[PDB]
Coordinates of C-alpha atoms in Angstrom, one line a residue:
Chain A
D3 CA 2.8 2.1 19.5
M4 CA 0.4 0.2 17.6
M5 CA -0.2 -2.6 19.9
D6 CA -4.1 -2.7 19.6
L7 CA -3.8 -3.3 16.1
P8 CA -2.6 -6.4 13.9
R9 CA 0.5 -6.3 12.9
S10 CA 1.5 -8.8 10.1
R11 CA 4.7 -10.9 10.0
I12 CA 6.6 -10.3 6.6
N13 CA 10.3 -10.5 5.1
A14 CA 11.8 -8.1 3.1
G15 CA 10.1 -8.4 -0.3
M16 CA 6.8 -7.9 1.4
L17 CA 7.7 -4.2 2.4
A18 CA 6.8 -2.8 -0.9
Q19 CA 3.4 -4.6 -0.7
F20 CA 2.2 -3.2 3.0
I21 CA 2.9 0.5 2.8
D22 CA 1.6 2.1 5.3
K23 CA 0.7 -0.8 7.5
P24 CA 2.0 -2.2 11.0
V25 CA 4.2 -5.1 10.2
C26 CA 6.4 -7.2 12.8
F27 CA 10.0 -7.5 11.2
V28 CA 12.2 -10.3 12.8
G29 CA 16.1 -10.1 11.2
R30 CA 19.4 -9.9 12.0
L31 CA 21.7 -6.7 12.9
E32 CA 23.4 -6.1 10.1
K33 CA 24.5 -2.5 10.8
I34 CA 23.8 0.7 13.1
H35 CA 23.8 4.1 11.5
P36 CA 26.6 6.4 13.1
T37 CA 23.6 8.5 14.7
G38 CA 21.9 5.3 16.3
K39 CA 18.5 6.5 14.9
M40 CA 18.7 3.7 12.1
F41 CA 19.5 0.2 11.7
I42 CA 19.3 -2.7 8.9
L43 CA 18.2 -6.1 9.9
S44 CA 18.4 -8.8 7.1
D45 CA 15.9 -11.3 6.9
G46 CA 15.6 -14.9 7.0
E47 CA 16.4 -15.4 3.3
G48 CA 19.5 -12.7 3.3
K49 CA 17.3 -9.7 2.2
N50 CA 17.8 -6.0 3.8
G51 CA 15.2 -3.8 5.7
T52 CA 16.0 0.0 7.2
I53 CA 14.6 0.5 10.9
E54 CA 14.1 4.2 11.5
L55 CA 14.0 4.9 15.1
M56 CA 12.3 8.2 16.7
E57 CA 14.9 7.9 19.5
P58 CA 18.5 6.4 19.5
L59 CA 19.4 3.3 20.6
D60 CA 20.6 3.2 24.2
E61 CA 22.7 0.0 23.8
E62 CA 24.4 -2.1 20.9
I63 CA 21.8 -4.4 19.4
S64 CA 22.7 -7.3 17.7
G65 CA 22.0 -11.0 17.1
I66 CA 18.3 -11.4 16.2
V67 CA 16.1 -8.6 17.0
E68 CA 12.1 -8.1 16.5
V69 CA 10.5 -5.0 15.1
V70 CA 7.3 -3.4 15.2
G71 CA 6.5 -0.6 13.3
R72 CA 4.7 0.8 10.8
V73 CA 5.9 0.8 6.7
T74 CA 7.0 4.1 5.6
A75 CA 6.6 5.9 1.8
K76 CA 10.3 4.9 0.9
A77 CA 9.6 1.0 2.1
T78 CA 11.5 1.2 5.7
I79 CA 10.1 0.7 9.1
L80 CA 9.5 3.1 11.7
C81 CA 9.6 1.5 14.5
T82 CA 7.2 1.8 17.1
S83 CA 9.1 -1.0 19.4
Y84 CA 11.4 -3.5 19.2
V85 CA 13.2 -6.6 21.1
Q86 CA 16.5 -8.9 20.9
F87 CA 15.7 -12.6 20.9
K88 CA 17.8 -14.3 23.5
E89 CA 19.6 -17.4 22.5
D90 CA 20.4 -20.4 25.1
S91 CA 22.3 -24.0 24.1
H92 CA 20.5 -23.3 20.6
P93 CA 20.8 -20.6 18.4
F94 CA 17.5 -19.0 16.5
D95 CA 17.0 -20.6 13.0
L96 CA 16.2 -17.7 10.8
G97 CA 15.4 -19.5 8.0
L98 CA 12.7 -21.5 9.5
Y99 CA 11.2 -18.2 11.1
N100 CA 11.0 -16.9 7.1
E101 CA 9.7 -20.1 6.6
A102 CA 6.8 -19.5 8.6
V103 CA 5.9 -15.7 7.2
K104 CA 6.1 -17.6 3.6
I105 CA 3.2 -20.3 5.5
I106 CA 1.3 -17.3 7.5
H107 CA 0.8 -16.1 4.3
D108 CA 0.1 -18.9 2.1
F109 CA -2.8 -19.8 4.7
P110 CA -4.2 -16.6 5.8
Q111 CA -7.9 -18.4 6.4
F112 CA -5.4 -20.6 9.5
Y113 CA -3.5 -17.8 10.7
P114 CA -5.9 -14.5 10.7
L115 CA -4.8 -11.1 11.1
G116 CA -6.9 -9.7 13.3
Chain B
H3 CA -7.2 -32.4 23.5
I4 CA -5.0 -29.0 23.3
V5 CA -4.9 -26.7 20.1
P6 CA -2.4 -24.5 19.3
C7 CA -4.4 -21.1 18.2
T8 CA -3.6 -17.4 17.4
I9 CA -5.3 -14.4 20.0
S10 CA -6.8 -13.7 16.9
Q11 CA -8.7 -17.3 16.4
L12 CA -9.7 -17.2 20.1
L13 CA -11.3 -13.4 19.5
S14 CA -13.1 -14.9 16.7
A15 CA -14.6 -18.0 18.2
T16 CA -18.3 -18.5 18.9
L17 CA -20.3 -19.7 22.0
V18 CA -23.0 -21.7 20.9
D19 CA -24.3 -22.0 24.3
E20 CA -21.4 -22.5 26.9
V21 CA -19.0 -24.1 24.2
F22 CA -16.6 -22.7 22.4
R23 CA -16.0 -23.4 18.3
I24 CA -12.7 -21.4 16.5
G25 CA -15.0 -20.7 13.2
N26 CA -16.6 -23.7 13.1
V27 CA -15.1 -26.5 15.3
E28 CA -15.6 -27.1 19.0
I29 CA -12.3 -25.7 21.6
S30 CA -11.8 -25.3 24.9
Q31 CA -8.4 -26.2 25.7
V32 CA -5.5 -24.3 23.7
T33 CA -2.3 -23.0 23.5
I34 CA -0.8 -19.5 22.5
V35 CA 3.0 -18.3 22.2
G36 CA 3.2 -14.6 23.0
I37 CA 5.0 -11.5 24.2
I38 CA 3.6 -9.7 27.7
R39 CA 3.3 -6.3 27.4
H40 CA 1.8 -5.7 30.7
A41 CA 1.3 -7.8 34.1
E42 CA -1.4 -6.7 36.6
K43 CA -0.3 -8.4 40.1
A44 CA -4.0 -8.4 41.8
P45 CA -5.1 -10.0 44.6
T46 CA -5.5 -14.1 44.7
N47 CA -4.9 -13.8 40.3
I48 CA -2.3 -12.5 38.3
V49 CA -3.3 -10.7 34.9
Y50 CA -1.5 -10.9 32.0
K51 CA -2.0 -8.7 28.6
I52 CA -0.2 -10.9 26.2
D53 CA 0.0 -10.4 22.8
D54 CA 0.9 -12.2 19.3
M55 CA 0.9 -9.7 16.4
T56 CA -2.4 -10.9 15.2
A57 CA -4.3 -8.6 17.0
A58 CA -4.7 -6.7 20.6
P59 CA -3.5 -8.3 23.5
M60 CA -5.3 -10.6 25.3
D61 CA -5.8 -11.0 29.0
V62 CA -4.3 -13.8 30.3
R63 CA -5.6 -14.8 33.9
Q64 CA -3.8 -16.9 36.4
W65 CA -5.4 -18.0 39.8
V66 CA -2.7 -17.8 42.0
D67 CA -3.8 -18.4 46.3
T68 CA -1.5 -17.0 48.9
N75 CA 7.6 -14.0 42.6
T76 CA 5.3 -15.4 40.8
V77 CA 4.8 -12.7 38.6
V78 CA 6.4 -13.1 34.8
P79 CA 8.4 -9.7 33.5
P80 CA 6.8 -8.0 30.7
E81 CA 8.6 -8.1 27.3
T82 CA 9.3 -11.7 28.2
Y83 CA 8.0 -14.4 25.3
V84 CA 5.8 -16.9 27.1
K85 CA 4.2 -20.1 26.0
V86 CA 0.5 -19.8 27.5
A87 CA -2.2 -23.0 28.2
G88 CA -5.1 -22.5 29.6
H89 CA -9.0 -22.9 28.2
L90 CA -10.8 -20.2 26.7
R91 CA -13.5 -18.0 28.7
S92 CA -15.9 -15.3 28.4
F93 CA -17.9 -13.1 30.0
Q94 CA -20.1 -10.6 28.6
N95 CA -18.7 -11.0 25.0
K96 CA -14.9 -10.3 26.3
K97 CA -12.5 -13.1 25.8
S98 CA -10.1 -14.4 28.0
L99 CA -7.7 -17.0 28.7
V100 CA -7.6 -19.2 32.2
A101 CA -3.7 -20.4 32.5
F102 CA -2.7 -23.4 33.9
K103 CA 0.6 -22.7 32.6
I104 CA 2.4 -19.2 31.3
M105 CA 6.1 -20.3 30.3
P106 CA 9.1 -18.4 29.7
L107 CA 9.9 -19.6 26.2
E108 CA 13.7 -20.6 26.3
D109 CA 14.3 -21.3 23.1
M110 CA 12.3 -18.9 20.2
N111 CA 12.7 -21.2 18.0
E112 CA 9.5 -22.7 19.9
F113 CA 7.7 -19.9 18.6
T114 CA 8.8 -20.4 15.1
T115 CA 7.4 -24.1 15.5
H116 CA 3.9 -22.8 17.2
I117 CA 3.4 -20.7 14.2
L118 CA 3.6 -24.0 12.0
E119 CA 1.6 -25.9 14.9
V120 CA -1.5 -23.4 14.5
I121 CA -1.4 -23.8 10.9
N122 CA -1.6 -27.5 10.8
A123 CA -4.0 -27.7 13.5
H124 CA -6.4 -25.8 11.9
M125 CA -5.8 -27.5 8.7
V126 CA -6.1 -31.3 9.8
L127 CA -8.8 -30.0 12.2
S128 CA -10.9 -28.1 9.2
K129 CA -14.2 -29.0 7.7
Chain C
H3 CA 1.1 -45.8 19.2
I4 CA 1.2 -46.2 15.2
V5 CA 2.7 -43.7 12.9
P6 CA 1.3 -42.4 10.2
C7 CA 4.3 -41.9 7.8
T8 CA 5.6 -41.8 4.1
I9 CA 7.5 -44.6 2.5
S10 CA 10.6 -42.0 2.3
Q11 CA 10.3 -41.3 6.1
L12 CA 10.5 -45.4 6.5
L13 CA 13.3 -45.8 4.2
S14 CA 15.2 -42.7 6.4
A15 CA 15.0 -44.8 9.7
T16 CA 18.3 -45.9 11.4
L17 CA 17.7 -49.6 12.7
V18 CA 20.6 -49.6 15.1
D19 CA 20.6 -51.4 18.5
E20 CA 18.0 -53.4 17.4
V21 CA 14.8 -51.1 16.6
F22 CA 14.1 -48.4 14.2
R23 CA 14.0 -44.6 14.9
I24 CA 13.4 -41.7 12.6
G25 CA 15.7 -39.2 14.8
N26 CA 16.2 -40.2 18.4
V27 CA 12.6 -41.5 18.3
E28 CA 11.9 -45.5 18.4
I29 CA 9.1 -45.9 15.5
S30 CA 7.8 -49.7 14.6
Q31 CA 4.4 -49.8 13.9
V32 CA 3.4 -47.3 11.3
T33 CA 0.2 -46.6 8.8
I34 CA 1.1 -45.3 4.9
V35 CA -1.6 -44.9 2.0
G36 CA -0.3 -45.9 -1.0
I37 CA -1.1 -47.6 -4.7
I38 CA -0.9 -51.3 -5.2
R39 CA 1.9 -51.8 -7.7
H40 CA 2.4 -55.6 -8.1
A41 CA 0.7 -58.5 -6.1
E42 CA 2.4 -61.8 -5.9
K43 CA 1.1 -64.4 -3.7
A44 CA 2.8 -67.4 -2.2
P45 CA 1.2 -70.3 0.2
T46 CA 2.3 -68.6 3.4
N47 CA 2.0 -65.0 2.1
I48 CA 1.3 -61.9 0.1
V49 CA 3.6 -59.6 -1.4
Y50 CA 2.5 -56.0 -2.5
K51 CA 4.7 -52.8 -3.6
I52 CA 2.7 -49.8 -2.4
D53 CA 4.0 -46.7 -3.8
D54 CA 3.1 -43.3 -2.4
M55 CA 5.0 -41.3 -4.9
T56 CA 7.9 -40.0 -1.7
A57 CA 10.0 -43.2 -3.1
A58 CA 10.3 -46.1 -5.0
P59 CA 7.7 -48.6 -3.9
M60 CA 8.1 -50.2 -1.1
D61 CA 7.6 -54.1 -0.2
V62 CA 4.6 -54.8 2.2
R63 CA 4.0 -58.2 3.1
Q64 CA 0.5 -60.0 4.2
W65 CA 0.9 -63.4 6.3
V66 CA -0.7 -66.0 4.4
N75 CA -10.4 -61.8 -4.4
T76 CA -8.0 -62.5 -1.6
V77 CA -5.4 -60.4 -3.0
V78 CA -6.1 -57.2 -3.9
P79 CA -5.3 -55.8 -7.7
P80 CA -3.1 -53.4 -8.8
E81 CA -3.7 -49.7 -9.3
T82 CA -6.0 -49.9 -6.1
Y83 CA -5.1 -47.4 -3.4
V84 CA -4.9 -49.0 0.4
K85 CA -4.2 -48.1 3.6
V86 CA -1.4 -50.2 5.4
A87 CA -1.4 -51.0 9.0
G88 CA 2.1 -52.4 10.0
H89 CA 5.4 -53.3 11.5
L90 CA 8.6 -51.7 9.9
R91 CA 11.1 -54.5 8.9
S92 CA 14.7 -54.4 7.3
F93 CA 17.1 -57.6 5.5
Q94 CA 20.4 -56.4 4.4
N95 CA 19.6 -52.5 4.8
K96 CA 16.7 -52.7 3.2
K97 CA 13.5 -52.1 4.4
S98 CA 9.5 -54.0 4.4
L99 CA 6.2 -53.9 6.2
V100 CA 4.9 -56.9 7.4
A101 CA 1.1 -55.6 7.5
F102 CA -1.5 -56.8 9.3
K103 CA -4.3 -54.6 7.8
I104 CA -4.4 -53.7 3.9
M105 CA -7.4 -52.6 3.7
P106 CA -8.2 -50.8 -0.2
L107 CA -9.9 -47.2 0.7
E108 CA -13.7 -46.8 -0.2
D109 CA -13.1 -42.8 0.4
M110 CA -10.0 -40.9 -1.4
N111 CA -10.2 -38.3 1.1
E112 CA -8.4 -40.5 3.5
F113 CA -5.5 -40.2 1.3
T114 CA -5.7 -36.5 1.4
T115 CA -5.8 -36.9 5.5
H116 CA -3.3 -39.0 5.8
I117 CA -0.6 -36.6 3.9
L118 CA -2.3 -34.5 7.3
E119 CA -1.8 -37.0 9.9
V120 CA 1.9 -37.6 9.1
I121 CA 2.8 -33.8 8.5
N122 CA 1.3 -33.1 12.0
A123 CA 3.0 -36.4 13.4
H124 CA 5.8 -35.5 12.5
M125 CA 5.7 -32.2 13.7
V126 CA 4.3 -32.6 17.4
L127 CA 7.2 -35.7 17.4
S128 CA 10.7 -33.9 16.4
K129 CA 14.0 -32.7 18.2
Chain D
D3 CA 11.9 -45.9 -14.7
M4 CA 10.2 -43.0 -12.8
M5 CA 8.0 -44.9 -10.7
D6 CA 11.2 -45.7 -8.9
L7 CA 12.2 -42.0 -8.2
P8 CA 10.6 -39.7 -5.9
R9 CA 7.3 -37.6 -7.5
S10 CA 6.4 -34.6 -6.2
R11 CA 2.4 -33.6 -5.7
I12 CA 2.1 -30.2 -7.8
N13 CA -1.1 -27.9 -8.9
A14 CA -0.6 -26.2 -12.4
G15 CA 0.9 -23.3 -10.4
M16 CA 4.1 -25.5 -9.5
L17 CA 4.5 -26.7 -13.3
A18 CA 6.5 -23.6 -14.2
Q19 CA 9.0 -24.4 -10.8
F20 CA 8.8 -28.2 -11.7
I21 CA 10.3 -28.7 -15.4
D22 CA 12.1 -31.6 -16.3
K23 CA 10.9 -32.4 -12.9
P24 CA 9.1 -36.3 -11.9
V25 CA 5.5 -35.3 -10.8
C26 CA 2.1 -36.4 -9.1
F27 CA -0.8 -33.9 -10.6
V28 CA -4.0 -34.8 -9.9
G29 CA -7.0 -33.0 -11.3
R30 CA -10.3 -33.3 -12.6
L31 CA -10.7 -34.6 -15.9
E32 CA -11.4 -31.2 -18.6
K33 CA -11.3 -32.7 -22.1
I34 CA -9.5 -35.9 -23.8
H35 CA -8.4 -35.3 -27.4
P36 CA -10.0 -37.7 -29.9
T37 CA -7.2 -39.8 -30.4
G38 CA -6.5 -40.3 -26.8
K39 CA -2.7 -39.1 -26.8
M40 CA -3.7 -35.5 -25.5
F41 CA -5.9 -35.0 -22.1
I42 CA -6.4 -31.8 -19.7
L43 CA -7.1 -31.7 -16.4
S44 CA -7.8 -28.9 -13.8
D45 CA -6.8 -28.3 -10.5
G46 CA -8.2 -27.5 -6.6
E47 CA -8.0 -24.1 -7.7
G48 CA -9.5 -24.6 -11.1
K49 CA -6.5 -23.9 -12.9
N50 CA -5.6 -26.9 -15.9
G51 CA -2.6 -28.4 -16.8
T52 CA -2.3 -30.4 -20.1
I53 CA -1.3 -34.1 -19.9
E54 CA 0.4 -35.7 -23.1
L55 CA 0.8 -39.1 -23.9
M56 CA 3.7 -41.6 -26.0
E57 CA 0.8 -44.0 -26.6
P58 CA -2.8 -43.5 -27.3
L59 CA -4.7 -43.3 -24.1
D60 CA -6.4 -46.8 -23.7
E61 CA -9.6 -46.5 -22.0
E62 CA -11.4 -43.2 -21.1
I63 CA -11.1 -41.5 -18.0
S64 CA -13.9 -39.1 -16.3
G65 CA -13.8 -37.4 -13.1
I66 CA -10.8 -36.6 -11.4
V67 CA -7.3 -38.3 -12.2
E68 CA -3.9 -38.8 -11.2
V69 CA -1.2 -38.5 -13.6
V70 CA 3.2 -39.6 -13.2
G71 CA 5.1 -37.9 -15.6
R72 CA 7.6 -35.5 -16.3
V73 CA 7.4 -32.1 -16.6
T74 CA 8.4 -30.9 -20.3
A75 CA 9.9 -27.6 -21.5
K76 CA 6.6 -26.6 -22.5
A77 CA 5.2 -26.5 -19.3
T78 CA 3.4 -29.8 -19.7
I79 CA 3.3 -33.8 -18.5
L80 CA 4.8 -36.3 -20.4
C81 CA 2.6 -39.0 -19.0
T82 CA 4.0 -42.0 -17.9
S83 CA 1.1 -43.6 -15.9
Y84 CA -2.4 -42.5 -14.5
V85 CA -4.9 -43.8 -12.4
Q86 CA -8.4 -42.2 -12.1
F87 CA -9.8 -42.0 -8.3
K88 CA -13.1 -44.1 -6.8
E89 CA -15.6 -41.7 -6.5
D90 CA -18.8 -43.8 -6.7
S91 CA -19.6 -43.9 -2.9
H92 CA -17.7 -40.5 -1.6
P93 CA -17.2 -37.3 -3.5
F94 CA -13.1 -36.8 -3.8
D95 CA -12.9 -32.9 -2.0
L96 CA -10.4 -31.4 -4.7
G97 CA -10.2 -28.3 -3.0
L98 CA -8.4 -30.3 0.4
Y99 CA -6.5 -32.0 -1.5
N100 CA -4.9 -28.6 -3.1
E101 CA -4.5 -27.0 0.4
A102 CA -2.4 -30.5 1.2
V103 CA -0.3 -30.2 -1.7
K104 CA 0.6 -26.6 -0.2
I105 CA 1.4 -27.5 2.9
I106 CA 3.6 -30.6 0.9
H107 CA 5.7 -28.0 -0.2
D108 CA 5.5 -25.7 2.8
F109 CA 6.7 -28.4 5.4
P110 CA 9.0 -30.0 3.1
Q111 CA 10.8 -32.0 6.4
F112 CA 7.5 -33.3 7.7
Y113 CA 7.0 -34.9 4.0
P114 CA 10.3 -35.7 2.2
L115 CA 10.6 -36.0 -1.0
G116 CA 13.4 -38.9 -1.3
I117 CA 15.0 -41.1 0.8

């Protein structure tokens, strides 16, 4: 529960550049592992990230999921906690979120990490 | 006016008297978008720990005089003004609203960035 | 309320009922910054082709040197107009810039104004 | 001509991503070839871009120049026109401009290239 440190918002392609750091990964539920202790989220540009759980799911997740955790040595994310975004008459646009992720990183001085 | 911000920007503001400067530009009324991690119903005020991922959760206070607590893990839009005690900054909010549409959350990122760009010096 | 725009945003506005809209937002009095590509003085008006790189130069008109010279960066404050499916501005202020940083900040005003004015 | 098409405001780093595309490159003049058939401009990040001309350079440019041309296969720019920025009263902040360029490419829904 690294909730008292800054967690960087990233996408798949940034996994390898954030090994061992707290990150926040928002993606769409693609697949749940038979055991329920892992699942894959695809980011706004169609790329996949592997999310590892300490405890198995108790409910079936779907739609947009926001994961907070630490990137492991194998470029997966070891989840500390996750939330499932809700969606009203307006569906969540993952494409634009990926863009805000690319912007966040283009302007670190206007979106400081801690 | 109201400047869109991140808690990391807030915790890095300097009080040059009783007035706050966000890096270089004065500011007081601000907006943030985050998740309630914890909610504490005190006597006359509800205190929330809101988190936007940019730093540790921040204390956001709401003076509520005589059903008003937003549940934890709910994404919210907070609007108030920056405050400070013995160096520990907080937020007094006139508004804390559960985000109906999460795209409003992504838009805030855009607003924060284009607000510190166009107001930078 | 004046809205800073790019010539490309002006071209995409929808003249429907009688007014203009860049979405479902009414628009009329705007601002742009571009280069003066051509000047044509006439007894009751001056027409300039102002270029902000976002499209082909747009027609900007001023009622009744007096005429700003080509290759001059200018700031225009005017009203949106339209012939047979073709836009132009009737300018009431066409001030050549003294500070080009005003050009840079207009790009930022545009982006901010069109962000905090969308659906 | 190109003056009737949209031209993207770029910086040296975007040349590779804009080959054969009409662009507008703003920069400080680094050097001008003797004949005036080619000059170099450096951008808000200090990186250079070379400007080729079909015709010899009439005047002799100086400070911050704004070029309109189409990027060649060799990642340079074939110039169709250019203008020198006015700097006699206020110096042009080339660095803030570069941040603007980055924003234009990051928020195209709010700064459209087209019509």
